[PDB]
Amino acid sequence: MQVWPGQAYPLGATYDGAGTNFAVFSEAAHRIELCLLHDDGSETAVELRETDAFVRHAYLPGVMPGQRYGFRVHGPYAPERGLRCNAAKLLLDPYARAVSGRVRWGEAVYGYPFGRPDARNDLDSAPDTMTSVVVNPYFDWGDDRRPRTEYHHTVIYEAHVKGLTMLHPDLPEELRGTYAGLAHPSVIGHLRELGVTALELMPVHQFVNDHRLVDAGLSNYWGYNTIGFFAPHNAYASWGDRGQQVLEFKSAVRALHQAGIEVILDVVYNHTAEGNHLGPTLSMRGLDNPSYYRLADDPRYYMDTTGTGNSLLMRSPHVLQLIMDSLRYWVTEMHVDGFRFDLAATLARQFHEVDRLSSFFDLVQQDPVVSQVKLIAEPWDVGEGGYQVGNFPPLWTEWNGKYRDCVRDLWRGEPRTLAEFASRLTGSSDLYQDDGRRPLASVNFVTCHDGFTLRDLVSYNEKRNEANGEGNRDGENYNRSWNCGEEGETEDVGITELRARQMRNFLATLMLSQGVPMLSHGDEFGRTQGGNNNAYCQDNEVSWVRWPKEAEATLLRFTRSMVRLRREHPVFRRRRFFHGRPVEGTHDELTDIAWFTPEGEEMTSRDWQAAHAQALTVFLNGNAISEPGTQGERIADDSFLLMFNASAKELEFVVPDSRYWRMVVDTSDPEGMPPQQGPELAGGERVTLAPLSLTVLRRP
Template sequence: MASISLSMALTSCKSGISTRNSQFRLLGWNNFPKFQLCFLNQSCSQNIHGNIISLDSKSWVPQSVSSSTLGPTMEEVKESWYRFLSENGGVVKVLVLDHNGNYTVRIEVSNLSKDVMGEGLVLEWGMYRSDSSQLIGPDGVGTVKVPLMRNSLGEHAAELEFQSSQPPFFLSFVVLNSTGSEIKSHRGTSFCVPIGIGSGKPMPLGFSLSDDGKANFSLFSRNAESVILCLFENGNEEPDLEIELDPYLNRTRDLWHVCLDVVNKYSKYGYRCKGPLDWKKGGRFHMRYVLLDPYSKTIENFIPDKGEKVSFAKCLASLASEKKSFDWGDIQNPNLPMEKLVLYRLHVGLVAKNKSFIGIIEKIPHFKQLGVTAILLEPIFSFDEKKGPYHPYHFFSPMKKFGSIDSLKEMVKAMHKDGIEVFLEISLSGTSEGDDTAPQPISFRGIDNSSYYMNGGVSILNCNNPVVQTLILDCLRYWVVEFHIDGFSFVNSSLLLKASNGIDTLSRPAFIESIAFDPVLSKTKIISDTSSPAELCAQDIEFPHWKRWSEMNSKFYTDTRNFLRGEGLLSNFATRLCGSGDKFSSRGPAFSFNYITRNFGLTLVDLVSFSNASELSWNCGEEGATDNAAVLETRLRQIRNFLFILFISMGIPVLNMGDECGYSTSGSIAYNDRKQMNWSSIKTPYGKQITQFIAYLSALRSRKDDIFQRREFLKLENIIWGGSDGVHSEPNWLDPSCKFLSVVIKPENSELESDSDSESTLASNGGRVFICFNSGANTETAVLPEGSTWVRLVDTALPFPGFFVSGDESVVQVAGMSTYEIKPHSCVLFEAKCSTE
């Protein structure tokens, strides 16, 4: 037996594989030879390909392998077996022994006739990593020829040894007879064996480490013809090592997978995918791009193009192997009932002074003061900063500019400690990869565009495709389990109902239903939001819910704005006040998330300062900035009215960041025109009174929870509507000229009211309320209902601080058949102090 030791000292470089004597560049992206290979680990005996002879690895131990070759003991050596049929009827057996990263490869050839063998056999071999057409030997060029020596069993054999610094690579070889004719596999290709490379496992998707330190990579691509794994050393933007995956060995149905024994010297990875560029069928493959693994949990910074130089690796996944456990202590998710929520929507980069998750923690006292019980974070998934957060390119990792993974967990932990839930906004309607007019392949587009996206070359994820559905569900579960997220709001959610063609609407979308019944996600709050920050609009659609999905109520937005600007029907406004039974009759008012302003369009201050038909806004008499005292007074009343209606309506009030302190975009409705919040404005007279008013309204909702925080709708007999002629007159519901409405709401437990004048009676949950709304320019006279002494709690027409009642101030009591003037553009709330019924 001849044992040939080769000390090649191969090292990786950016452009290929270098040796001490020369450098080899990777040229082209050819597929593997289509060889038939039986890969056997330990006692595997399954026939993988029809013509391959199966072999139990424990049934064959080559006699010529000595103990000195194998190392100290057999138990310390990992072995892999391969067995091929040759085109001449012979058998080629390969044994790969792993001695803690040092490899011995034994090749044996048998069953060849003398006519085929001739006077002797020679092994011609070479190595490659990503280009099977270019082989190198120990000198970095060409191939190497090694004589095969006959052993006592009549087999021709040779051994090759490789040091731990050389793998991973593929060993490719043919057998030459004495005439120089090649003996190949029965398919007419070279024999090929991976060294330091295993077939890997299809699950889990993404990058994972086994207990023995081996790295497994798994990627979905149904339509790729070949996949190349690209590994990068720290700081490099070009691959330092590329490994082409074989469709026979490294593919299970639509999953490409590979296992590497060691990846310690590399810090990042990505993939190149080759496939048809078939525009009609959705193929958008391009081998130049190194693509981000959709399942990676940690990614590196986005790499922008530099001048005329185009970067073909926009973003790479991290190979960080240390998974530090985060100490959540004994802090649990608040798990608040839906009806107890007061939601505050914010943009991390615009709210926090240092634009980070940690900076949000500093705002917790402010949220607590307002009575906020949940925050909704605008998309924090990794995105292209030029396009904004509603164009993500990855869903498993937070944007690095906002802070680390642990800093996000610290923020969630701090929120939960103070009883505040954390929701994430998710946009699946347009990624950073763009469309066919301006493509930017980062991940999904280059991996398998036709599977991930809807037809037509757009970047809208095809969520009702089972593969995409699984990806998003896995992602959402990851955020719930790993980050303790309490809920999700899906922006532009109407697209979640679309079929793969992007046109047809599904009556029972699999994605929506899967979330509703998922064992993990069904325990979170799930919100549908049909608003589109890109198109600056919201659709009113019938969204399937299975009594699990709640919705951002766009009808509340439009009908409330119309009423306060003196337009619209009283019937529409009254429906919103009572929880929008036309939309939520089968679910209850707690599924309605009511909002006046949103994260695009006019802010609350701009809503009363600019007239815009698409925004249903009214400038109160003059456009934009003004010194007119009467106009300013009307604007202030309207702001109070909007907030008042938001908090006393059944459903969940949603505040938009900065509305409490006069945040303005000078009338711009574009999402990208928003700027950093100026928190010093919270100390201005406006900021102080609006902040205090919101805090008062939050406390009022909590105290009167039997009216304003309900899971079920109030019974009709507990609601008495009134028009301008008093509570006993029916409002003119369908007359657009009517601008006054009053209502008495009697809680279902109002029989608990007593005649006591004590403070406890005033604070009782059983008291009736009488509310008046005047959106007209004339004063209206309201007749207070009989049978109670009424306490005025709010009158938005009064000057600050008297327009709402605080605990230290006296209250105005009105008894009997008293009347009360409702000023123009104002709302008034009374509470029954004592019932005589």
């Protein structure tokens, strides 16, 4: 009942101690109403009249947080002109700092009558839809020391916010599956014992349960399909949904930085949950359709290049703004350490149909907030020629798809070249050069959420995604996976211990390779998705995490004692990866590395093209480490000796240099042998090595 004009910046819900400033963009709306929602379901419509930059805005004192607010836009309803505004639907603030409730699917949330897509729907959208919230922006990050952990000291961990803690019998069933159950000391401590420096969560941006999904008993579980990029997802909030979740995720980040674990929340900006036409009408299509979504040359239909349904307009400057304003809000206000752009390949494509691609990596590389955080993405190829960009921000990294496809295609049985294999342990120096013209790292992974899990990775040759309901045609088809003898679990102990060390190999490869190793959550305990490699709608025992009570425990203390080895020996984590100098080393008795035959000699000019690159002996030196440290200190370390047997028949290797070596790891024995103490070796002496197995020696 008291309306001041207020300010045009910042857009959204911003509370000035005893007032609130509301701002909403639209360049094609007629009139905007801000409907202050009451608990009894009544609308207190305040027309917003001050116009600046096509943003209507007004300030209401005495309107304190928890206040539920929406928008109503009267605009032209012409699907011929891309004008799909509607006054009946109560729109959502794209800068909603928090959102209450869930989508209750009905006729009302659709904005066209089910019979006619070009007709106008005039149902009230108000009770069924969600509801944006005025977030109290105060928070006490007490000693919030920003963990500036380096890339060459990082161990990422891909974990889901609900699927992680739903079954830990240590957390109250109150906090099970929730953001606070993330910052529980026992869980914050399970990573500390692993030795991970980077927690990369899945989308915490608030997402919508697909209509055609919940009406199938399922629910979007991963949720790369969002509506509001300024709010924690509310079904992960055990502290309620009336703005309290923002104090949740914030209380969970500070506790992570307490134990010095970074947060890397996942980010989708390649489509919106409103989907193509015939979808719902919730936030964007209603406020201003033709300058949030890229429309075809028939304004009635949205160009989905993938299956998503719609794509944002990456040339309309107000859309560029929601992205940089979205990224900045988390880094600064929720104190997040890096991002990862889902379908950054579909993302980086979209720009290049508006010339605006290489002008965006300029925006990234100039801004001080977003540049100096980790940006993790995936390689692409656009138009004709490739990336077609000049300057990659010098933290911008890719998930190495040609390393896992190279590792998976090693213990499987098929060949990768010894050249393909040399450059992969090396840290993919051939695809990611540190120049400042290419991504500067490789996020090595043997597995992630897409495709199998490490357990399923050696247990199936075809998927078993009939549980997704998509006719089994979905999901990665050629997982490059070998099942070790039979499909499904079988009792046969002969093969059941075969797999148990196949994962002891998949994990060891990841840790000794140069670069950034990433673990998917559950591959320490041996997590199984029932052969399902795309579990996006399995919000159940499929992608829950079973917590152990020996087999599942041997691998946990395998991983946890392996990660010790990575953190402890600097030849496996070289600040400048082998970007400069060759993979063989300039052959002499000083090089950082030199490759050997199981027979004993060095590889040679026409030896590097070994199609059956099954066996290898890689010697890394502990004194050729040509990098200064934190303070100009020469980082030094022992020399190590790797011996790979990606070949069934037992192989006999020979340790060169005549020097007392110590076997520090052996895949083949069942008790797990990072921790189990080992014997000394002489060097030169013939050793036998089990099939499909690794061994590593140590000497200063």
